[PDB]
Design an enzyme around this catalytic site. Structure first.
Site, mmCIF file in Angstrom:
data_model
loop_
_atom_site.group_PDB
_atom_site.id
_atom_site.type_symbol
_atom_site.label_atom_id
_atom_site.label_comp_id
_atom_site.label_asym_id
_atom_site.label_seq_id
_atom_site.Cartn_x
_atom_site.Cartn_y
_atom_site.Cartn_z
ATOM 1 N N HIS A 1 12.030 -16.559 60.150
ATOM 2 C CA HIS A 1 10.355 -16.030 60.542
ATOM 3 C C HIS A 1 9.908 -15.853 59.177
ATOM 4 C CE1 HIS A 1 11.154 -16.504 64.160
ATOM 5 N NE2 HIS A 1 11.403 -15.847 64.309
HETATM 6 ZN ZN LIG Z 1 14.853 -14.731 67.587
#
Ligand SMILES: [Zn+2]
Ligand SMILES: [K+]
Ligand SMILES: [K+]
Lengths: 363, 149, 228, 126, 42, 292
Positions: free
Chosen positions: A132
């Site tokens: 992320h």
């Molecule tokens: Zn995840």
């Protein structure tokens, strides 16, 4: 002959008071690998911590230097600059942050360097794979994006890399890193809708010369082993037919199991390990990293099983007495089950998206 | 034995308040005092005005001082400053769209350098497109987590 | 004066009240934002990016001071007597604290008491003792060979009467270095064994006592086996 | 008067305290023990070929011992780790077992005879 | 034994009245003991 | 089970019910989206035996509760029977005037909540019966719906436990059939409301007033208006009114919320009728109905 990276310190870090992300989970995994006598079938390595010049090929030097200088007790001078880099609320600042980032990124770059030089075919870094984190800010529990560095390392020798992602969340950092290139292809199987991070639409397939070279599979609630298999095997098979990868980075997030803290799928240990089996069966150079996973008993058991099965062994069903045994009561077995949560994928939907994907992949 | 609730009334304060009511010559004055307290609770009665009415009902200076000490009163110029947030926390959603979520970057943001990039990574990595997630506005049917076991 | 005490405590709680708080009974579900729905019991944890909301308004803890120590408590599942709540809505229903934490008072109770019987059914000592033996044995297979080489190098070997450097041709300045390193190795390997043997023998003492007690607190139900 | 079983109630806590210390230490050992086994088998084969001197005769005795010397130098830092862990475990279990023993000395006193010697007629005694 | 017996009653009462008690809190040392230690270290 | 039960229990909360009806009423009053005033809840209650089924389940559970003493069981059973028969008219060119006159009930928040619960229970039982009959697998048995009823009867008295109950329910594989377990919760809330009414000393006249208005043939406004003024007076000066109207022709229950100056009859077929009703109200009604 599987390289298995593990640094002993990574299990001593601590995100915050009640945070859902615990690096301690990785330690639990090792504590079952040792007591399962898999220590001898694996080439266990200790990662060389990544320097600061290693980490700023993806990220910016300003963000990495901020990560370097910050400190939980001297952030009265950084407090203004905190949220410029998204740090502070769900990516907190804790004691020893840069060490943890260097450990994970160093494990990943080390695995890539093992595969480059023929010293193995399969590498494992269970404490990396944070997909992320973006180029200039933290994002959703991840500060430095090690997977982009692993792939940037692989691309020195190999020619086309494939990044497969079975974390229930979308792998947005990686996809955005390599979004305008054809030499890396990203494939994600993610719950879509009113969910984090809210990207990952079935019409987002790259730009420039990267057109068609991304794959988003937007699933829905409650999906289970058979439907997941039915949509996983066709697309993977056609990608290996038409893309012809040379290296495979497999992201093995475990918040897609049944019972997770932040998950909405219904897979089980068999349904999850089917993906590792099927991707291994193509006989390729394969890095196999970790990811999500927030109910730590499940994460420990599943990742232990997948390591014992990536090596080639057959671990018992019962659990060997170790230090974290009581986490696994009251049954004490290496099995993770599923519940009667109701599926939401009608067969027509799965077939529609599968056909749209495959018709995209014909170019 | 008996448990002390959080912020439970201490014995000194209960003693003092019952002596306050006793100095109050009437049960009607005690009721007016409860009314003062309640109206302060219901965001219709200020702090200083509570103190003023309390004094004009108690007519005793040391109890006024004990109240002002219990009320935790402090008269200082309340300072209110308004600081905007950094440009980078909201600016993305003014960028010329390319797709649903990928927005072209402006030239002022393609002006910072990564110092460990060799000639390979300047030709593989993506430089000028961000991923601006979409923003809900007024969600009006919120789902919960129901499994309590 | 109980009502007056409740009033004083309520006023104290009002003074105690934080500058920013959540008044609405409904909490913020997943909801992935706070716009519009502030004052919603947990909306301070939510914003634009907000992986989720992990803390639901059901595990919230309230501290109560007893004696000198404060004990937290889960107060969402109180009695809270009402029409909507059934008993089996309570996770911690039928978890009797008064009988889990209670003492024995009768020896035979050792075999029926829930928690204690769950304790005398673990075999963690019998696993550890066998693991200790398995560890000692490999070390000793190594130490025996080191020891043979040592009695050869010192010279106290009945089958080797000559000088040891001769019987495997090496300079007498190489034999001394070899003897030094072999001595260090042999001594350390002997010490490890001497310690691990004490560890193992004390584990065995524990096992012996445990079985003796299990057999005492069986009275006339003593059939030789003592696997609970 | 009537007797509570204080000792019998502490015994059950000691019996639980015992395994945990050594649990941590046992795992810490198994790691080291498993990253040293190849070198130990090397050393065993080397000592065997040097001590028989007649069964695997392919060497120059001056070098056949330089190899054994280097191999012994390699294994030395592992023996120290094993010694530290063994002394730690020894101390922990010693304290725990002193406690458990002091307890069992008493739990055998406040228990009725018929519960450990049987009724005076369930004894064969021909 | 006395200490356990007292704690059981406290927790059963707190159970009936307020809620279900979580694990015992992990707290620091006393003010007096912190004081004495900073002294003898000083 | 958990999603269904949690959404359920979170739905039937007193304050939540009141806030729902209040929001709808407020949206009407100001014509935010073009919505004009009128009724805020409408629903049709066709069967007449389902009410006896509900009474059966209610008494079954009532004999096995533990809040109420020996006499409150009789009291609550009686009150439920009375309010069922009287209001809903269930047996426990010169005749259509009845079916043309809608019967009116005026109460406070407690009554509105009670009636919302009863309509929910009815709706779920009826959906159950329809699904057992129309679905061609368990309809093939003579009394599959009836088997369900008898099993629930068994369980509510303490003769069967919850594990057998739930595993037997799992046979239907149906959420629609998951909805049978909620009946215990619904009945508990209902008994509670009714009991708090039996202690509400202002109840009597109220229901008595109901009895009174169960005897007219076809009402002229003035009687209904003086009824409404009676009710509005018996409460404190602050309260609202809730109006529940029964159409036996369509067998339809309609509910609305009335504040001081609100119209009780929304539909007038000619301005002369409107003027007549107004003048009558100005005469009798405490505050003129229909004035801004
Ligand atoms: Zn995840
Ligand atoms: K790409
Ligand atoms: K994914």
């Amino acid at each position: 002959k599987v390289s298995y990276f593990y640094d002993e310190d990574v299990g001593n870090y601590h995100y915050g008071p009640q945070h859902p992300m615990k690096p301690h989970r990785v330690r639990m995994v090792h504590n079952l690998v040792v007591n399962y006598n898999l220590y001898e079938k694996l080439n266990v390595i200790t990662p060389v911590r990544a320097t600061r010049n290693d980490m700023t090929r993806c990220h910016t030097d300003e963000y990495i230097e901020f990560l370097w200088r910050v400190t939980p007790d001297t952030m009265e001078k950084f407090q203004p600059h905190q949220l410029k880099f998204n740090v502070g609320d769900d990516c907190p600042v804790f004691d020893g942050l840069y060490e943890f980032c260097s450990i994970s990124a160093g494990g990943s770059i080390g695995a890539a360097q093992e595969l480059n030089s023929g010293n193995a075919e399969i590498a494992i870094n269970w404490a990396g794979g944070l997909h992320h984190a973006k180029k200039r800010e933290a994002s959703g529990f991840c500060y430095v994006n090690d997977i982009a560095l692993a792939a940037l390392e692989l691309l020195k020798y190999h020619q086309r890399v494939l990044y497969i992602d079975i974390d229930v969340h979308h792998g947005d950092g990686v996809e955005e890193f390599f979004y305008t290139t054809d030499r890396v292809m990203t494939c994600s199987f993610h719950k879509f809708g009113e969910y984090f991070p809210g990207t990952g639409h079935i019409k987002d397939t790259g730009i420039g010369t990267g057109k068609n070279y991304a794959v988003n599979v937007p699933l829905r609630d409650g999906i289970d082993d058979e439907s997941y298999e039915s949509v996983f095997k066709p697309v993977i098979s056609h990608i290996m037919q038409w893309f012809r990868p040379e290296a495979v980075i497999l992201q093995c997030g475990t918040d897609s199991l049944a019972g997770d803290r932040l998950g909405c799928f219904n897979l089980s240990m068999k349904g999850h390990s089917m993906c590792v089996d099927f991707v291994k069966s193509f006989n390729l150079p394969m890095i196999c990293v970790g990811g999500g996973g927030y109910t730590v008993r499940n994460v420990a058991r599943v990742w232990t099983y997948e390591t014992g099965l990536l090596a080639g062994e057959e671990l018992d069903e019962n659990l060997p007495y170790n230090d974290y045994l009581q986490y696994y009561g009251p049954d004490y077995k290496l099995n993770v089950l599923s519940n009667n949560m109701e599926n939401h994928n009608t067969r027509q939907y799965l077939d529609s998206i599968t056909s749209e994907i495959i018709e995209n992949l014909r170019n | 034995t008996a448990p002390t609730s959080p912020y439970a009334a201490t014995q000194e304060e209960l003693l003092a308040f019952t002596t306050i009511r006793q100095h109050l010559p009437d049960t009607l004055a005690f009721h007016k005092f409860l009314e003062l307290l309640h109206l302060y609770r219901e965001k219709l009665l200020d702090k200083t005005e509570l103190l003023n009415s309390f004094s004009k009902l108690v007519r005793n200076d040391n109890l006024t001082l004990w109240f002002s000490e219990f009320i935790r009163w402090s008269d200082n110029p309340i300072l209110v400053k308004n600081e905007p947030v950094d440009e980078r926390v909201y600016l993305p959603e003014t960028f010329e769209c390319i797709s649903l979520t990928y927005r072209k970057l402006p030239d002022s943001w393609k002006q910072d350098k990564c110092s460990g990039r060799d000639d390979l990574d300047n030709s593989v990595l993506n430089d000028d497109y961000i991923s601006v997630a979409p923003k809900p506005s007024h969600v009006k049917n919120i789902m919960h987590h129901e499994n309590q076991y | 004066m109980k009502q007056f005490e409740e009033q004083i405590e309520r006023f104290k709680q009002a003074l105690f009240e934080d500058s920013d708080a959540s008044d609405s009974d409904s909490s913020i579900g997943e909801a992935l934002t706070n716009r519009g729905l502030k004052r919603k019991k947990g909306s301070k944890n939510v914003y634009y990016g907000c992986v989720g909301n992990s803390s639901g308004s059901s595990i919230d803890i309230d501290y109560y001071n007893i004696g000198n120590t404060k004990r937290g408590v889960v107060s969402h599942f109180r009695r809270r007597i009402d029409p909507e709540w059934l008993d089996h809505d309570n996770p911690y229903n039928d978890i009797n604290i008064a009988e889990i934490m209670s003492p024995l008072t009768k020896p035979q109770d050792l075999l029926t008491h829930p928690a204690i019987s769950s304790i005398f059914e673990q075999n963690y000592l019998s696993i550890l003792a066998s693991s200790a033996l398995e560890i000692i044995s490999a070390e000793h297979k190594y130490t025996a060979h080191l020891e043979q080489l040592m009695v050869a190098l010192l010279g106290d070997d009945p089958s080797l009467p000559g000088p040891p450097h001769e019987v495997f041709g090496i300079s007498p300045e190489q034999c001394r270095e070899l003897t030094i390193t072999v001595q260090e190795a042999l001594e350390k390997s002997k010490e490890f064994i001497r310690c691990w043997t004490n560890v193992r023998m004390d584990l065995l003492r524990a096992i012996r006592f445990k079985n003796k007690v299990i057999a005492y607190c069986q009275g006339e139900d003593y059939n030789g086996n003592t696997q609970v | 008067g009537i007797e509570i079983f204080a000792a019998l109630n502490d015994f059950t806590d000691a019996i639980v305290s015992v395994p945990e210390s050594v649990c941590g230490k046992f795992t810490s050992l198994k790691e080291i023990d498993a990253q040293v086994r190849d070198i130990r088998q090397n050393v065993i084969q080397e000592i065997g070929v040097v001590l028989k001197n007649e069964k695997n005769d392919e060497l120059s005795g001056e070098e056949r011992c330089e190899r054994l010397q280097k191999t012994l130098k390699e294994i030395l830092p592992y023996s120290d780790s094993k010694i530290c862990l063994a002394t730690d475990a020894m101390n922990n279990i010693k304290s725990c077992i002193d406690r458990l023993d002091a307890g069992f000395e008493y739990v055998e006193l406040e228990i009725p005879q018929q519960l450990r010697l049987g009724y005076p007629d369930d004894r064969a005694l021909m | 034994k006395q200490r356990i017996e007292y704690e059981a009653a406290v927790l059963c009462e707190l159970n009936s009245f307020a809620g279900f008690p979580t694990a015992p809190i992990i707290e620091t040392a006393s003010f007096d003991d912190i004081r004495n230690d900073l002294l003898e270290m000083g | 089970y958990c999603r269904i039960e949690g959404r359920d229990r979170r739905g039937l909360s007193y304050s939540r019910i009141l806030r729902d009806i209040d929001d709808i009423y407020q949206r009407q009053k100001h014509r935010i989206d073009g919505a004009k005033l009128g009724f805020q809840f409408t629903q049709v209650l066709c069967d007449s035996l389902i009410f006896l089924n509900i009474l059966r389940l209610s008494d079954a559970q009532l004999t096995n509760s533990s809040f109420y003493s020996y006499a409150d069981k009789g009291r609550i059973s009686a009150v439920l029977k009375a309010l069922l028969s009287q209001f809903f008219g269930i047996p426990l060119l010169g005749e259509e005037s009845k079916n043309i006159i809608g019967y009116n009930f005026f109460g406070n928040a407690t009554m509105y909540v009670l009636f919302r619960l009863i309509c929910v229970c009815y709706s779920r039982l009826e959906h159950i019966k329809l699904f057992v009959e129309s679905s061609t697998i368990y309809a093939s048995s003579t009394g599959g719906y009836e088997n369900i009823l008898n099993i629930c009867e068994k369980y509510l008295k303490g003769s069967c436990s919850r594990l057998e109950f739930r595993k037997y329910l799992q046979k239907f594989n149906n959420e629609t059939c998951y909805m049978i377990c909620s009946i215990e919760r619904l009945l508990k809330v209902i008994f509670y409301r009714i009991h708090e009414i039996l202690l509400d000393p202002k109840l009597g006249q109220l229901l008595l007033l109901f009895e009174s208005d169960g005897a007219n043939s076809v009402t002229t406004p003035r009687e209904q208006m003086v009824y409404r003024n009676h009710v509005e007076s018996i409460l404190a000066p602050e309260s609202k009114i809730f109006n529940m109207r029964w159409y036996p022709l369509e067998k339809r229950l309609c509910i609305q919320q009335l504040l001081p100056a609100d119209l009780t009859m929304h539909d007038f077929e000619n301005p002369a009728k409107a003027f007549m009703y107004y003048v009558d109200s100005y005469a009798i009604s405490h505050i003129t109905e229909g004035v801004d």
